[PDB]
Amino acid sequence: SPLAAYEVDDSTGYLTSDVGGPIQDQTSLKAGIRGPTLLEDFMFRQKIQHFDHERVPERAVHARGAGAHGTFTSYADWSNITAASFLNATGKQTPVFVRFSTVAGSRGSADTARDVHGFATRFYTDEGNFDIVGNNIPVFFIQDAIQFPDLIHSVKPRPDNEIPQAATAHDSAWDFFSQQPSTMHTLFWAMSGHGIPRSYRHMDGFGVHTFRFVKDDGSSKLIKWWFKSRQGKASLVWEEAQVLSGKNADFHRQDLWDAIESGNGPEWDVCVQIVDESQAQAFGFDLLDPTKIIPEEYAPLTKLGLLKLDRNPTNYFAETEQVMFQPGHIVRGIDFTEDPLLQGRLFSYLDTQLNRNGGPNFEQLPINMPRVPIHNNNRDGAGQMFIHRNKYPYTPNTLNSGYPRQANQNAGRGFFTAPGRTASGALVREVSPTFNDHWSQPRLFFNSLTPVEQQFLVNAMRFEISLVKSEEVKKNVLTQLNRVSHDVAVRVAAAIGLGAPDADDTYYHNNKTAGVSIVGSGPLPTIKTLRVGILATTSESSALDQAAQLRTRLEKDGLVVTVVAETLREGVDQTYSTADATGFDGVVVVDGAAALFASSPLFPTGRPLQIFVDAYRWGKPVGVCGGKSSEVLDAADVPEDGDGVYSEESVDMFVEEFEKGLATFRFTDRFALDS
């Protein structure tokens, strides 16, 4: 581990107190064998006090998440655009830690809630820790940090009864969205498949804000951070996500943990869009506005390096729960912009760690420590782990020979604000009029999805808005949707029994942009780690032989195979009782098992066929291997000539066809469209 010096080994030895005294911990000290417990039982109290105090406050947002360690490797010397030391040489490696998350749910809510997702990355650089605290969607709901508690209160559970958990599907959230039209862009992303990603590994990361790269000469450029997934993009379908939220609330954290342990650690190209300072207002919107993307057509990506996650934590609480990210963790070569959302975040993340840690020395926790020396005059505070030798911790001093020395642009590789930055004007609590177009980019995004994706987005809105009780809120929602697309407002209105307002075409257009569609991003670049369920039976030795031969051929290509049957035994991983279509990316029935697809105390009535039908309905590749397919496919009402439906006698031919299906990932012709 990068954190090996802090590890504690309990694989041998006798139980001790926290101060090394050998003890026991299984029976209380009592006044007689059936007597009361004694106050002098220090073994009891130290153990129970620790237990009683194990919990800390969950993060105010992004409470539900999971993390891993890895490495970042630079592809080049990037001194031509940034002074940043971690980017200063081809092949230069820096340790990282990444945490992924949802936003709204509390820390035991479901991974597969519909939500924006966090993607937070720490680079433990040789010039200090640098954090990029990003999301899987490139734009944010609001244009000023001061509005964050309004947004978050509205999407979190109603505060009288704390209902509903981890969901925007309630009156307050849609009230906020409909009254605060800045929200439209992020709303459209959340209501697309980007709100229900297949895994953390199958989503991109974005810094959201425009930042600055600063060279050692003082010149600056504007950048956006883009982490492009090397696993490809993929989503769940909503009905699948809902079932998975109940069957496996830990789906995304399990997926990441398993990928790392199998040696399939996920990778991203860490990229930037780079533009000149003079282009802040050149693209038809303001680069200080975090509700806006720069279309790839206007500014192409530059690949800076490779991020790879390849080591799981030892202790979740100590590493994942305690990691404390800050946009204020910045290094020389990077600087902020006057994005009023970013500006306020700088305050929040330093302050909130006091709540979580309960004390000011949270940067001393192993996961938060830097990998280089600390020289400063910060002292004392609860939980102080350092023993400082310098007894003159003030500047300016002569009694410690003027150390530590000041670092700045010209000495000590100091951080420095980009020297060409200026401010001019009144001290104002006013919104820039350059931020006022809330609807054109939502429309750009919607235009850029495929017809079936558009249907899914409409369906997500129909689902959530149908659960809003207030007729006034629902009308207000249609008013805002209508400014993005009259068609969206018409199709959503049909579900909730309202009339859509008349078209208002001020912000309508037909422009599209590349790289935002999931369905459109073509077949996955790899099928390693994807999950194949083989449905078999113990009633036929030949079904288990078919299952074993399929397993060998699928495992050869790095697929994760689960053989399912009525009961466990050698070669069977899971029972029908525990199995669900949400556990697989493709489902194969071996034709020896055909009789299960027409009752048993060992699983719920119809379970084997339900797994197959659910997989088909949710767009997954499905098939029958062995050559006799009719009985299964007729029971399922699955047509044999369907796209992403397979039937072959030959195991080799079956797997070759099926693997193409897995790369296709989803067969979208199985979903009905509005007329």
Add this chain to the structure above:
Amino acid sequence: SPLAAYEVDDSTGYLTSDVGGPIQDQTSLKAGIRGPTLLEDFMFRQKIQHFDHERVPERAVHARGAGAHGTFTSYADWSNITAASFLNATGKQTPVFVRFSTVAGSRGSADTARDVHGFATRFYTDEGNFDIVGNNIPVFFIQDAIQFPDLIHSVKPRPDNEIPQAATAHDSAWDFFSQQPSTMHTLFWAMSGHGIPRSYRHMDGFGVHTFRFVKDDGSSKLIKWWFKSRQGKASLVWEEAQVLSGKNADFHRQDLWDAIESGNGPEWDVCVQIVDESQAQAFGFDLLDPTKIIPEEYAPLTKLGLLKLDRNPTNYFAETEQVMFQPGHIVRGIDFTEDPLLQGRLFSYLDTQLNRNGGPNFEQLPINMPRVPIHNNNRDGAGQMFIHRNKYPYTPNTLNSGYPRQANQNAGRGFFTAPGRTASGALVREVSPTFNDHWSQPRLFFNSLTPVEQQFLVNAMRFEISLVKSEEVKKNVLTQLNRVSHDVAVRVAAAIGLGAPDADDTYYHNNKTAGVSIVGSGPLPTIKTLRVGILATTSESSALDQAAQLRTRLEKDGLVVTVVAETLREGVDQTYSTADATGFDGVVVVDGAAALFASSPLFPTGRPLQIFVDAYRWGKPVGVCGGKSSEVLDAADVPEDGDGVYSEESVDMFVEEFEKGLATFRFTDRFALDS
């Protein structure tokens, strides 16, 4: 009341700071219109500091839960058995607050996880706050409080990756259960329908421990607390509970909130079993052992009074999240026993509130305050809300005339330890040999369930143990189950492909006890609040007329009716998109809607039929109203002669039959049994 004095109304007025200065909170103060945010923006920082610090640590256990206010009313003057003031007169009323919970899951986890459930009741008595901090299961996993962190660490998520959430279905939990055989009794309860109750209202509450009732003369008797539900007992089936965990993680808190708002606030008879001190060891087990029940046949229940919950909280965080229960909140007339589980609890609950509240003045929060004056020499600490006038807070004093006075058995209605209590022997960390029978009572419990209930319990163990990776742990589990029942171990072993160990009949017997079976507890005594889904269509004016006439007749009898259709409109509550069988206790299809049961952009393929089939498979009353009937029942493969299947042309006859079905609640003949 301390609650009413601290209520804050924001239905009018201008925004202020926390010190009453009128402000704004929508735009940050900036150095020019596109400039950086200023440090002097106090409006920004106060708002965000508050947001940053909103969270507090969740409870170490029972983190997921919900609460309500109500009243306890005594049925009699109970002076003849206890000095307790809240029980001292017929009709005497005391305010209560109750919180219900699961045990293992974090905040945000699903209500319908399989778990033990908390049932914690605060009586705000005229002689101080009295808490009975109970569960819905009458026995606990362990016999000594010092083991609690062992139990809890084993059932909570594995600490390297924090998987899995809110579940015992993992190796560590079953390792603990198999190595600590005290766990068998509670394990059997949790694996029965008691682990997945239909609602908080449909479960009982238990103090678990033997306590003492103490009279003003100093004599004592041993008691067990039993809160008997007046709503009846009911459970979910596992497959339903899993789906509901995903479709509605807030199911139990919603059910409670809704019942209270409709004027159907839940009721319990608060009862005790009362036995003499001399019977501590008379029933074949030790009354100090919290893994044991007293069979009703050995000691019948005395009804002390009525508990009714009838008012929802105003603010969840302030009331439900902050309520801080303690078994140390005891009143004169009650005393502890030397149960080593109870003994340690007394320490834990005082200590843990320091973690949650962050300071020592947690009893000053309105929900925790008493309803009588506080006179003591406790002073200072963080968050001190009182201004104490007594400037000589020490005893003994003359400078405050010797006040406050000491209270005890003889003066001031003081609490006093039961004066007959003694202790004798060595100071020991040893377990009493009277606690060593871990298996007979698990067997008593199993024997007392119906055949189908026994099958559900076996099925729950087959499900969970099949997910254990370690073959050695699975074998160890069978070893322990085998000591309860060879048949259980045989039936469980069949699912996980192991052999059961040979019968070991040391603890086997055929005794039964009344009142532990859910299936056996007869029809529900009321059907008010139960949920009827009517599946209709907007295609047919006659389908909506059928739905509306059914609605009128069902709503008359206090049922919560939802009409489901493709889209909302007058008379339709929910779309097929958001509807699920988990949302209903009974499902009716109107005849006019027959065509939906043979594709649409408005809901997933087969959703209407799936709701009906799911409802049937999970044992619910189902029917078709209109008198075509055959087409829908044939499509569903639901037999018309089936118990809990209704088929009538007449709406009146349909409802009369259907309502008996709702009282029956579950039709258990639809579940397969081991040979």
